[PDB]
Ligand binder design. Structure first.
Ligand SMILES: Nc1nc2c(ncn2[C@@H]2O[C@H](COP(=O)(O)OP(=O)(O)O)[C@@H](O)[C@H]2O)c(=O)[nH]1
Lengths: 522, 85, 82, 62, 205
RNA sequence: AAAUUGAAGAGUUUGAUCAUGGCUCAGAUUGAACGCUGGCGGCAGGCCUAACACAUGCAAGUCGAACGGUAACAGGAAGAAGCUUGCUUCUUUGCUGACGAGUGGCGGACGGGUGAGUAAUGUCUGGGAAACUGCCUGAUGGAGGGGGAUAACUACUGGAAACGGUAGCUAAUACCGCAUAACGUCGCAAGACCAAAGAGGGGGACCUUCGGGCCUCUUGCCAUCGGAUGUGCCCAGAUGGGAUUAGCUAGUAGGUGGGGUAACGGCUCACCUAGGCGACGAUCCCUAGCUGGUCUGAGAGGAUGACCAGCCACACUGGAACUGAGACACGGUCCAGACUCCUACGGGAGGCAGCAGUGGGGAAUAUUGCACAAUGGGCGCAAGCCUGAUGCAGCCAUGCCGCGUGUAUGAAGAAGGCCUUCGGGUUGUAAAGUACUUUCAGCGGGGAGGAAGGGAGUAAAGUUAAUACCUUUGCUCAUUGACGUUACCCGCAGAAGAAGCACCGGCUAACUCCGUGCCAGCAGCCGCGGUAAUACGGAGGGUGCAAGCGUUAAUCGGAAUUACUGGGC
C-alpha cells in the first residue's frame, strides 16, 4: 500500500528573501509556490530513501500569500539566507509568517561563494534582528571564493566537496587547522544547547563528559520540534556545495507528520477535542486545500495536504467549511509544472485535485464526517488598487472572467467594478504583483488591457519617520498621532483617496520594504 | 504513431514494394503482347501471349490481381491476336 | 460468421435478452436478421424465463450460423435432458 | 433592444449585464422584452412579499 | 403529496359531507358546514358552469384523497378503457387500496386507511402492499397482518364501520381481519350524488 | 373475442346589433432556461450554440499450438557461494513453464462519435442484372519436391530521438520457381495455363543420429462449385423554398473501337453523329442529412428527426493512394496548409465530431469515475488477454411515475391576526391538549437474483490399430458479481427529519381592509390606478397545483384563420 512509511516523509518549505538562493538550492536538490517531491536516501546511501516534499516559494512581498498559504500546510521550514546580507526585511517577513504558524525552522545560509560572505556574522544577524537562537550545525571552510566545504559539530569532519563533477562526489576530510579551534568552540556551544532537552541531559553533561552524537541529534531534533532552537547550515548552491548536508539536516531535525502532536480540528463549533486528528493511513479522510491554481491546460487545479485519512481517485469529499459535496477524477502529484496522475494519497502527502469546482484556498476537504474547519482563516489585505480597460471597450466580459478566475486563484487579489461610475478596479499587493496579473491576463486569457487610475495608519522602522512624513506632508496629508511603539513607530495620517495612488510602492522603496499601512475611509 | 498500427505501416509498405514489383512485371509482359499486336506478328504475338498467360494467372492466384482481371486480360489478348492476322 | 446471440433489452438491473440471429459485425442491440425466441433471466413463474424458436435456429445453423455460449446453454436448458 | 424593468425600484447602470426575456409592455410602443429580475446582477425588487418568484425575491421569514 | 390541512374546511366548501372526519359524532357539531371557509363564506358565489364542474371534480378528489396528477391519470385510464368513462373512473377510484381498506374498516377515515396501507400494516393476499393507490383486483383479499391488530385503532374503526352503508362488494370478516373484493362496484353501488359526467366534461374540455 | 367510441368554446371593434375580420386565452407537448422553493425512491434524460480548438489519462489488441529466440520471473540440471555433501541458494544450460522485443497470421474497415458536407452520387418504397465476399457452412479432391533470402540476433557508420547507408547472417504457416490439378481460366473447338503450410496431443509397436522417424486423431493450408452473409451497381416513384432563379449542357446525349473495373456504365481515351435536359420547373440561389418514428390533431393535416433503431456522410482543412475479402481508412501512409507541442537547434511529433475532461461561446447541458461479473466484439485449441463497447455508479426536480411530510380526537369554537353593522364573524378542530401508528429518511442486523459458465477429477460410449489423446454427454469438487453497506426482510426511537409556488376585476375557481393617489406601479387580451382600487403594494382570508410552482421560449390545436376533408370575391 503505502510506498514510503510516514516517518520517512518530510514536508519542507524553502522560504527566504529574494534571490537568497531558494530556487537554486531546489535545483541542486533535484540534482543530488512550486511543490515538488524528491527521494533523498542519504549522503552515504544511508537513511533508506526518504520522500521529501519540497514547496519552493516566492520571496517577493507582492507574493506573500503564495508563501503564507503554504506555511500552514508545511511541517518544517528551511529558511534560506544570503551570506553577505543575511537577514533582510523580506527575510523578517517570511520569518513572521512562519512564527504565525509555529513551524519548526532550520536555516541554510547560502551564498558563501560571494565576496563579503560570512557565517558567524549572519548567525549573529539572525540572533539580533529576528530573535531566533541559532545552533550552528556547520561552519564554513573557505571565506568567499576559497569556500570548499564545512565542518560538522557532530561528525567533526570536513565534507569538502569535489568541484570536478558538480557537487556529488564530496570527500570526508581531516578537518585541518584552517579552522580546527573555532570548530571545537562551536561544537561545545552546540553540545551545551542540546543538553537543553531534559534534566537528565543536564545531569548527563554536568558529569564533565560529552554525550554521544546519536542522543545529541535526537535531542536537537526535539528542540527544533518544540521550536526551542534553529539549526543553521552552510552551503553554496551556485558553486554546487553544501546542499546535500542541508538535506541531511532536513532528514535529521525537521519533523515527519508523526513527530508532532495531532492536528486539532472542529466538529461543528469549538469543542474540547472536537476533531483532533493524527496523521494515519486508517483515519477518516481530512485534508486542507492550501492552494488553488489555474491550470493552463484546464483552468482549475487544487493543491492539498492530507492531514488525517486516505482519499482515492473518485472518492466523494465534504467541503466542511463550505458544507457541500466534492468528488475526485484526476489526482496529480509531480514536479513544479509536470503532473503525474496517481490513484490515491495517504496522510502526509501533497497532491493536486481536479474538477474541484467549489473549494477555495484554505478550505478543508474531508470525508462526510471530518472537521467543519481546520484553522487557516487569515490572509493579508490588498494594498494597491488600479483600474483596467481592454483594447476594445466590449471585451470586458472576457476581462471580468479572467479577473474572476485569477481572483479565485489569489485570495489576496480582489476585483470589483466599483459602482461609483462603472470602473473595473483591481486590488493586488504590489506593483510587480499587478504586473504579473496583467501579463497573465494577456497571455493565458488573452486580452490586452492597459491599466490606469481617510485615516491612514502606518508602521515603519524608527529611522524612516522623517522621510515617510515628508512623503505624507508631500501628499495632502494631515496627521493624527505622533506615537512610537517599541519595534518601530505608528504613524497616523489623514490623506485624500484620489491620492497616493501608489503609496505602497512609494512606501516600500522609502521604508526599505519594511512597512505596512491601511487607508479605510475616515 | 500511437498504437502498434505502425507495424501494419511497415508491412503495408513492404507489401507495396513487392506488389509493385510483380504488377510491373506482369504489366510489362502485357506491354510486350500489345507491342506485338500493334506490330502485327500473329506468331510473335502468340508467343508473347503464351509467355504472359502463366504470369498473369499465377498473379491472380497470388491475389495481386483478381481472377476476373486475369481472365479479362486473356480474353482481350485472344480477341486481339485472333483479329491480328 | 452469422451469430445467434442475446440482445440485452430490458431495464437497469433487470435485463431481458432476445435471441437474435445477427451478423457478428453489427452491435449487440443493433441490426439483426431475425429473432428466434427471447430469454428472461429473472423469472420465477413466467414462461420459463426462456423461449426459443428451434426450427428456425436449426435452419440457420444448417446455413452455418454460429451459436453463442449462452444461446447454446439455452438450447441445452430447452432440451429437457439438461 | 429596449426592455422593461418590471417591479418597483432597480439598480441598472449603463454597463450592468442583465437577463432579457420576452413579454411586451403594451403601452410602451416598441418594447417587447422584459428584464429578468433577480438574475445577473439585476437584483430583485426589494420589499416584495407576493409573487416573489417573479421579481426574484428570496423567501422572507415572516 | 397529501393534503395535510383542515378537512372540515374542504367539506363545508363542498357544503356536503365528504367524511374526512370519522362519522362518529356529527358534522355540524364539529364544523359549521353550511358556509364556505372564508370570512366571505356567508356570502354566495354564483357558481357558473366551470364553477360547478371544478367543484364536483374537487369533491371527488377530496373524498378519495387523490391529487390532480394521478387524478388526470385515473381519467386517462377509463378514457382509454371500455364502457362509461365516469363509471370506469369511479371504479378505478374504488379500486384504490386505501379505499377498500376504509370501506372494510381498519380505519375510520381515508387518511387513517392511508396510514394503514403505508405503514406495512396491510397484506393484499399475504404480500405486504403499502402503495395507497394499489388498484385492488377483484377476487382478492386484504389480510390486516398480525402486529397491526389490537392496536385498538383498527378495533375502533371496525366498530365504527357500522352505522354505515354496508358495501355490496366486500365481505369483511371483522376480527378475523380478512376482507375480499368479490367484484368491482357498478354504478348504482355508490353515493349517486356524484355526477361523474361533470368530471368527464371538465377533463374533456 | 379487443385491437377503439370520436369533433366544446371564451374575451376583444359598437351607445347597442348582426356579420366579416385579426389579436388573445383555456389543452397537450419539450433534450428546456430563469425566479422562488425543494424530502425520498424507481425509470429515463442531459452541449439544441463554436464540425470552435484541444493538454494529458484511457478508447485495439491477441496468438509461444507459425518461427527464429531468451530480455524479465519461475521450475528444474552441475556445483568447489551460502555450507550441518545444501532446506541454511554461487553461476552456465531455452532444457521447461513461460515471456520483452522481432518475423508472421488475424483483427485494426467492427464497435464508439458527430451531422459539417449533401436537395440527390443521399434516403424511403418496390423491382432488377452486368458482380465480388475475410471469418461461418456443405460437396469433391490436393496437400510431391526445392531454392534464395530476411527481421530479430548482429561486422563498417549515421541519428537528441525517431531511425537510415551498406552489410555477417539465421528461421517460419514470410517469399519464389518447379512438379501436379480439372465440373477451374482463356478458347467455338482443339488446346494452353494456375496452388498449397504446416502445427499440436498422446501411443501398441519397431526402428535411433535421444533429432526423431512411425500409427493415429485434433486443428491448420490450396482449388473449384454451393449456401448464408455482407457489399457494389441500375431503375421507377416519392422525398424542401425561391420564376424578385428560363434557359442549361460540350464528355455534354448517344454510336463504334481500344482501355479500366470484382462488375454494367463516358468510367475512360480516339473518332462520329448533334444530340440531351427544360414551364411535370431544367439551370442557379438559400436552406437541409434521410427514414422508422416524436409532438399535436376526431381526422385529414401541421410541426419535427433529442433519446432508440436502419441507411448515408465526415474524421483538423485540401488531394492521392497503398495494404487488404472489405478503406480511398477517428485513434494508419504520403503530400500542401493552418495550428500546437518537444529540441541538445542538428531535427522531429500530433489531430477528443471515442470516453471522461478543458478553454471558449451560450439562457443552457454531467463523472480526467468502477468492472469487464452479464451480454456482445477482436485474437486464440483453449485457458485467457483487451474493449471509455456494454453493464453499473456519480451530478443535476430535466422529465414521467410512486410515496412521505402523520392518523383519530379536541370547543375554553383559546390566545393572536383580520374584518365588523361593534352584536359578532373568520382564522378554526385549525392550534394546543389526549390517544395511536413509524411508510420513507436515520441507526443495527439478515439477505435473493442478475451466474450462464469455465476449470480440476470422474465414467460412458464415439475414436484409433490402442482402456491412451481428443472430442461430445452425464456424475462429484472447489469456485467466478463491478454494482454492493444490492433489492427485499427484521428490529430500535419518537410525530420527530421533510411544503412550497402562483393566483383571486372578466375571460377564470377564488374578497375584504389598509396605503396609495393617471404617482408608484400591474397587464396573456380587455384594461386598472387622477381620494372609498376586490386590477398596484402590504395584510387577513380564499382558490388551484403540489416537491413542485410560475415566468419566458418553442410546436400543434382551438384557427373552417390557406378551408383536400373544410372558406370566400
Ligand atoms: N554567486 C552566486 N550566485 C548565485 C548563488 N545561488 C544563486 N545564484 C544566482 O542567483 C540568480 C537568481 O537566483 P534565483 O535562483 O532565481 O533565487 P530567487 O531570488 O529565490 O528566485 C541565478 O542566476 C544564480 O546564478 C550562489 O551561491 N552564488
Amino acid at each position: 500500500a503505502r510506498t514510503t512509511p510516514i516517518a520517512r516523509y518530510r514536508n519542507i518549505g524553502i522560504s527566504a528573501h529574494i534571490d537568497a538562493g531558494k530556487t537554486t538550492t531546489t535545483e541542486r536538490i533535484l540534482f543530488y509556490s512550486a511543490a515538488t517531491t524528491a527521494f533523498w536516501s542519504g549522503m552515504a546511501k544511508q537513511y533508506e530513501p526518504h520522500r521529501i516534499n519540497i514547496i519552493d516559494t516566492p520571496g517577493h512581498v507582492d507574493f506573500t500569500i503564495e508563501v503564507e498559504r503554504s506555511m500552514r500546510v508545511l511541517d518544517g521550514a528551511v529558511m534560506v539566507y544570503c551570506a553577505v546580507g543575511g537577514v533582510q526585511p523580506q527575510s523578517e517577513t517570511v520569518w513572521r509568517q512562519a512564527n504565525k504558524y509555529k513551524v519548526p525552522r532550520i536555516a541554510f545560509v547560502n551564498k558563501m561563494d560571494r565576496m563579503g560572505a560570512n557565517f558567524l556574522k549572519v548567525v549573529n544577524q539572525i540572533k539580533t534582528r529576528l530573535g531566533a537562537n541559532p545552533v550552528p550545525l556547520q561552519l564554513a571552510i573557505g571565506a568567499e571564493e576559497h569556500f570548499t566545504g564545512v565542518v560538522d559539530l557532530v561528525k567533526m569532519k570536513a565534507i569538502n566537496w569535489n568541484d570536478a563533477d558538480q557537487g556529488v562526489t564530496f570527500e570526508y576530510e581531516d578537518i585541518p587547522a584552517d579552522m580546527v579551534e573555532l570548530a571545537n568552540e562551536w561544537h561545545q556551544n552546540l553540545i551545551e544547547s542540546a543538553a537543553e532537552a531534559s534534566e537528565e541531559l543536564m545531569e548527563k553533561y554536568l558529569g564533565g563528559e560529552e554525550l554521544t552524537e546519536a542522543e545529541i541529534k535526537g535531542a536537537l531534533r526535539q528542540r527544533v520540534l518544540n521550536n526551542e532552537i534553529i539549526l543553521v547550515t552552510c552551503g553554496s548552491a551556485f558553486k554546487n556545495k553544501g546542499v546535500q548536508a542541508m538535506l541531511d539536516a532536513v532528514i535529521d531535525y525537521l519533523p515527519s507528520p508523526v513527530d508532532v502532536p495531532a492536528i486539532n480540528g472542529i466538529l461543528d463549533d469549538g469543542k474540547d477535542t472536537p476533531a483532533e486528528r493524527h496523521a494515519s493511513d486508517d483515519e477518516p479522510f481530512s485534508a486542507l486545500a492550501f492552494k488553488i491554481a489555474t491550470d493552463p491546460f484546464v483552468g482549475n487545479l487544487t493543491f492539498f495536504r492530507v492531514y488525517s485519512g486516505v482519499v482515492n481517485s473518485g472518492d466523494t469529499v465534504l467541503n466542511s467549511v463550505k458544507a457541500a459535496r466534492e468528488r475526485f477524477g484526476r489526482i496529480v502529484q509531480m514536479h513544479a509544472n509536470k503532473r503525474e496522475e496517481i490513484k490515491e494519497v495517504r496522510a502526509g502527502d501533497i497532491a493536486a485535485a481536479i474538477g474541484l469546482k467549489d473549494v477555495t484556498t484554505g478550505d478543508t476537504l474531508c470525508d462526510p464526517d471530518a472537521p467543519i474547519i481546520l484553522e487557516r482563516m487569515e490572509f493579508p489585505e490588498p494594498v494597491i488598487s488600479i483600474a483596467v480597460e481592454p483594447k476594445t471597450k466590449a471585451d470586458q466580459e472576457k476581462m471580468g472572467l479572467a479577473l474572476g478566475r485569477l481572483a479565485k486563484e489569489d485570495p489576496s487579489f480582489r476585483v470589483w467594478t466599483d459602482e461609483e461610475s462603472n470602473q473595473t478596479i483591481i486590488a493586488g499587493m504590489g506593483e510587480l504583483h499587478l504586473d504579473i496579473i496583467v501579463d497573465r491576463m494577456k497571455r493565458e486569457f488573452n486580452v490586452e488591457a492597459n491599466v490606469g487610475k481617510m485615516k491612514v495608519e502606518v508602521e515603519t522602522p524608527e529611522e524612516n519617520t522623517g522621510d515617510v512624513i515628508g512623503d505624507l506632508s508631500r501628499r495632502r496629508g494631515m496627521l493624527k498621532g505622533q506615537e512610537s511603539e517599541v519595534t518601530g513607530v505608528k504613524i497616523h495620517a489623514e490623506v485624500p483617496l484620489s491620492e497616493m495612488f501608489g503609496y505602497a510602492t512609494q512606501l516600500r522603496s522609502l521604508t526599505k520594504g519594511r512597512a505596512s499601512y491601511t487607508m479605510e475611509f475616515l | 504513431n500511437i498504437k502498434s498500427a505502425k507495424k501494419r505501416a511497415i508491412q503495408s509498405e513492404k507489401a507495396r514494394k513487392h506488389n509493385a514489383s510483380r504488377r510491373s512485371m506482369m504489366r510489362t509482359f502485357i506491354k510486350k503482347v500489345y507491342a506485338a499486336i500493334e506490330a502485327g506478328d500473329k506468331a510473335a504475338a502468340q508467343k508473347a501471349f503464351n509467355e504472359m498467360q502463366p504470369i498473369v494467372d499465377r498473379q491472380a492466384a497470388k491475389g495481386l490481381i483478381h481472377k476476373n482481371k486475369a481472365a479479362r486480360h486473356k480474353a482481350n489478348l485472344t480477341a486481339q491476336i485472333n483479329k491480328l492476322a | 460468421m452469422v451469430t445467434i446471440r442475446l440482445a440485452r433489452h430490458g431495464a437497469k438491473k433487470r435485463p431481458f435478452y432476445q435471441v437474435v440471429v445477427a451478423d457478428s459485425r453489427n452491435a449487440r442491440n443493433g441490426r439483426f436478421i431475425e429473432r428466434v425466441g427471447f430469454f428472461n433471466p429473472i423469472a420465477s413463474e413466467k414462461e420459463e424465463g426462456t423461449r426459443l424458436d428451434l426450427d428456425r435456429i436449426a435452419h440457420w445453423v444448417g446455413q452455418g450460423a454460429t451459436i453463442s455460449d449462452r444461446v447454446a446453454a439455452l438450447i441445452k436448458e430447452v432440451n429437457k435432458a439438461a | 433592444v429596449t426592455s422593461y424593468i418590471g417591479g418597483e425600484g432597480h439598480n441598472l447602470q449603463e454597463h450592468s449585464v442583465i437577463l432579457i426575456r420576452g413579454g411586451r409592455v403594451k403601452d410602451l410602443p416598441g418594447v417587447r422584452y422584459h428584464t429578468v429580475r433577480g438574475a445577473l446582477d439585476c437584483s430583485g425588487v426589494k420589499d416584495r412579499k407576493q409573487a416573489r418568484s417573479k421579481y426574484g425575491v428570496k423567501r422572507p421569514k415572516a | 403529496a397529501r393534503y395535510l390541512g383542515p378537512k372540515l374546511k374542504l367539506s363545508r366548501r363542498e357544503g356536503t359531507d365528504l367524511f374526512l372526519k370519522s362519522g362518529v359524532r356529527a358534522i355540524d357539531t364539529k364544523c359549521k358546514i353550511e358556509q364556505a371557509p372564508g370570512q366571505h363564506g356567508a356570502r354566495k358565489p354564483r357558481l357558473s358552469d366551470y364553477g360547478v364542474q371544478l367543484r364536483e371534480k374537487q369533491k371527488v378528489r377530496r373524498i378519495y384523497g387523490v391529487l390532480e396528477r394521478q387524478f388526470r391519470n385515473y381519467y386517462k385510464e377509463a378514457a382509454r378503457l371500455k364502457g362509461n368513462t365516469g363509471e370506469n373512473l369511479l371504479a378505478l377510484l374504488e379500486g384504490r387500496l386505501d379505499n377498500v381498506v376504509y370501506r372494510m374498516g381498519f380505519g375510520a377515515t381515508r387518511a387513517e386507511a392511508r396510514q394503514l396501507v403505508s405503514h406495512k400494516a396491510i397484506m393484499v393476499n399475504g404480500r405486504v402492499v403499502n402503495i395507497a393507490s394499489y388498484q385492488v383486483s377483484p377476487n382478492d383479499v386484504v389480510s390486516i397482518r398480525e402486529k397491526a391488530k389490537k392496536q385498538s385503532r383498527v378495533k375502533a374503526a371496525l366498530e365504527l364501520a357500522e352505522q354505515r352503508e354496508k358495501p355490496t362488494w366486500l365481505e369483511v370478516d371483522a376480527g378475523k381481519m380478512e376482507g375480499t373484493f368479490k367484484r368491482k362496484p357498478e354504478r348504482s353501488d355508490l353515493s349517486a350524488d356524484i355526477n361523474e359526467h361533470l368530471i368527464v366534461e371538465l377533463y374533456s374540455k
